[PDB]
Design a protein around this nucleic acid. Structure first.
Ligand SMILES: [Mg+2]
Lengths: 87, 95, 106, 97, 97, 82, 106, 95
DNA sequence: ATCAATATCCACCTGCAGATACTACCAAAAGTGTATTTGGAAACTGCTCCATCAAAAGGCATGTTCAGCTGATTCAGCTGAACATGCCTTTTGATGGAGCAGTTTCCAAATACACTTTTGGTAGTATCTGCAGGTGGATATTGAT
DNA sequence: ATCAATATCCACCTGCAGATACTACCAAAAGTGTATTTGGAAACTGCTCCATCAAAAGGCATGTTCAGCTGAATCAGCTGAACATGCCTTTTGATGGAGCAGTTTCCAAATACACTTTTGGTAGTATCTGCAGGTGGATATTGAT
């Protein structure tokens, strides 16, 4: 490794059109201008909660790699069971 | 070389029984494997609790039976109870 | 030399199920009919989902069940929908459903 | 030139996206967000690519279902436009806030 | 002949009932309803006194909270009067529907 | 004077519950609606409770049957054992 | 003859907790410190609630804690409220709270 | 005739430290008992899962710790962890 | 503004429902001494995960234009709040009566244990085939007029 | 209604990523017969649970009357959709290097298990007392004028 990259503001990588698509799938016809920042914030909380639990499982196992299983168990704890990734 | 069990071959047999000329993608199979594991733990979990509640140390087919009635909705519960009872009965007389 | 599966009339593996019940520490003792009954329930459930899923495959002119087919099966069926009310099927999408008022004209 | 009326294309997009199952957020931007959030909990983490994919499937399924609830709240208010107050009411009734 | 404005006594009852903890449904009618419903699952049933009580506590706590969400839904539609559609919306977003 | 047991859950009692939930004004249709919801609530919980009773081979529903039923229904109750 | 609770400096019964852990089928084996740790955590949380519950009794001109005080303690504290977010405390009532739009026009 | 075990005495001791002149009603005690039992079950159940996930046969204080971190809110977790480690330290260095 | 009706607040009093306190067992703690069972510690080999760079492949960003939605305003009709009068159901509490939980003690069936033999299910390596993605041309939907 | 721009449709073609096809250990089933242990079974006995009715205790049903809320109608201001244009960013498919999972085999530290002494915790039973509920009188809120 020559260096290591600094991650900042990646929430803006969740673009207005991507958010619009998700709304569309959710059956939404018309979208107020403020929705995009609100959704970004809601997604950030969602990810924080799940990643925190996933990472806790990673650490408990003394690993440095977050496995699909860490995420699946994290998701399960939070009443958001996922099928298709090993549990 | 690392070994990993799944219910896939069983799911595939059952698939072959109900839709003889129908296949299943590996991702669909992975979901089927998840589903079985999921329902396995829920039934076994309820059975576990049920035993504890009654100061029993054994999980018998009667615990699984009650767990199924607790866990499954109406009509699925009814039919799963048949198939379970049926299988147990056959297993007893078959031996 | 007979499997307990074939003794019970089951495709699902009774030996396996007995073993997993032991390792899961659900109780001190596991009765002999427990894994037989549970394997039958598991098999019943997967037959029910596979039936409806295969039908969804067919309604979409396909030979191979994919996750979308499993999702259509579950979500279109009241009881499977509830059983899996709090589960996400990866790559399942959603049911087509647009609310009345959103449609044009009067 | 030809122009569709406001809402016509929107309804088209509803049918299209309700018909398909691919992820609607871009693979890489979502990856960055995961790594950034995680890094803030713990430095020097790696991710199985399928751990990232599992997070994406979970995240998109949460968001699509939240928008259905949100949409229901807008329509309750006799609107057809979802607003932040709609998201907030959904999340409150869901027990998320 | 003194008369209170509509809603003044309502507000007064809110304060009164939010202050206390007594159960708000008469015991006996609740007991009958419990037994009636139980009867369809198993006939000739008996109930510990505390079992009925547990059921009442749980039911009343359930219904009170549902009225909070219901109320929020009515306020969302810019009303102050709860309506069935408000209950329906609250239960749908809760995942009860 | 017959009158079904559900109707025993009277208008004023439903009014009181609403009040504890901070409700100011109540539509006339709410009372029936509420009875319906309470019935579904009681059905789901009682069913599971009785399933516990039957399993224990009893003819009496205990507090604990109810407590366990509420737990598994995601409605944990405190103060009645367990 | 000295108790593990006194050894660990605890009021909560380390002995009982160890037993309860064994006879709970949580795992094949239970390490020595687990019941110590667990017992401490239980004691701690109890003291947290009893503190705030006590305070609540105090504010209401009372010396005996009743369910109401436990309710006020729990629901007025963000963290306890979340921990107990899906729990019902019998005879607890609710926090006084009226939505401001329902207030008469001052 | 049978002995009915309860956390009540310990709860009462802890009440005395925290509020020496404060008592408690029967019902309030019952609630406190439920609370201890619930939290016990949640912590243990999570610790149990951790062990299983990691193919271990033992529930050590490490599982209890991780379990607490998973279950308890931020600040409550922190203090509980310190109280737990404290208790384990005092107990180990005990001749 | 005043004037009054009614709700609410505080202080003080009192008996009893529901606390705390004191006791005599004993089931379950802690003690003591072998009997297994475990899951780091070191030492492998060996992948997936990360990083980069180039080309390819598409989606995103921004400005413009105006359709039609939101929210403010105003209004009248109806419906739900208040409250009087008026009846009947619930609460209380012996009674006491009996049922059925919960207590104890039994043993026979079923479960755990252990070993030795026999699979079935898995990982490795090598052909088969649904269908994704492209294209075609036929036809449907939308919106102008 | 017609007329035309643009989206959608369905059906067929085709190579290829992702299925299904044949194969060889071995962890895990199955079998077989000692040895333990559970939990129905049966017979109890004693609390609670149902019923009654007696008491009082009290809350709820009904009718009237009008305040003020909800919903319809109307409208302007302006947000958010559609779409044109220009270009960055993600996608995809290389490669290579290290960083870390994951498999295995050692024993030292730790937990089980069994057995014997020594409580702490519980049920029974006997005292004590917070405070629910009532009373009186002062003042606050609300609503009319
Ligand atoms: Mg950072």
């Amino acid at each position: 490794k020559r260096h290591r990259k600094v991650l900042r503001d990646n929430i803006q990588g969740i673009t207005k059109p991507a958010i619009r698509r998700l709304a569309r799938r959710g059956g939404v016809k018309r979208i107020s201008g403020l929705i995009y920042e609100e959704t970004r914030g809601v997604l950030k909380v969602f990810l924080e909660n799940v990643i925190r639990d996933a990472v806790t499982y990673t650490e408990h196992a003394k690993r440095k790699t977050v496995t699909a299983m860490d995420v699946v168990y994290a998701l399960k704890r939070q009443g958001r069971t996922l099928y298709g990734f090993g549990g | 070389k690392t070994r990993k069990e799944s219910y896939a071959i069983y799911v595939y047999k059952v698939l072959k029984q109900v839709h003889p000329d129908t296949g299943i993608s590996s991702k669909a199979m992975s979901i089927m494997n998840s589903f079985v594991n999921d329902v396995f733990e829920r039934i076994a979990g309820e059975a576990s609790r049920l035993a504890h509640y009654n100061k029993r140390s054994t999980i018998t087919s009667r615990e699984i039976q009650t767990a199924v009635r607790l866990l499954l909705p109406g009509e699925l519960a009814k039919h799963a109870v048949s198939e379970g009872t049926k299988a147990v009965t056959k297993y007893t007389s078959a031996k | 030399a007979k499997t307990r599966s074939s003794r019970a009339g089951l495709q699902f593996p009774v030996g396996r199920v007995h073993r997993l019940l032991r390792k899961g520490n659900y109780a001190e003792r596991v009765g002999a009919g427990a894994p037989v009954y549970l394997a039958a329930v598991l098999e019943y459930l997967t037959a029910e989902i596979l039936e409806l899923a295969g039908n969804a495959a067919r309604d979409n002119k396909k030979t191979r069940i994919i996750p979308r087919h499993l999702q259509l099966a579950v979500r279109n069926d009241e009881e499977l929908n509830k059983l899996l009310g709090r589960v996400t099927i990866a790559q399942g999408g959603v049911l087509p459903n647009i609310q009345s008022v959103l449609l044009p004209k009067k | 030139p030809h122009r569709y009326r406001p809402g016509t294309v929107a309804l088209r997009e509803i049918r299209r996206y309700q018909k398909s199952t691919e992820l609607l957020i871009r693979k890489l931007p979502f990856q960055r967000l995961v790594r950034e959030i995680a890094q803030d909990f713990k430095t020097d983490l790696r991710f199985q690519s399928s751990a990232v994919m599992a997070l994406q499937e979970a995240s998109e399924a949460y968001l699509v279902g939240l928008f259905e609830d949100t949409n229901l709240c807008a329509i309750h208010a006799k609107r057809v436009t979802i607003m932040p107050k709609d998201i907030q009411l959904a999340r409150r009734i869901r027990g998320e806030r």
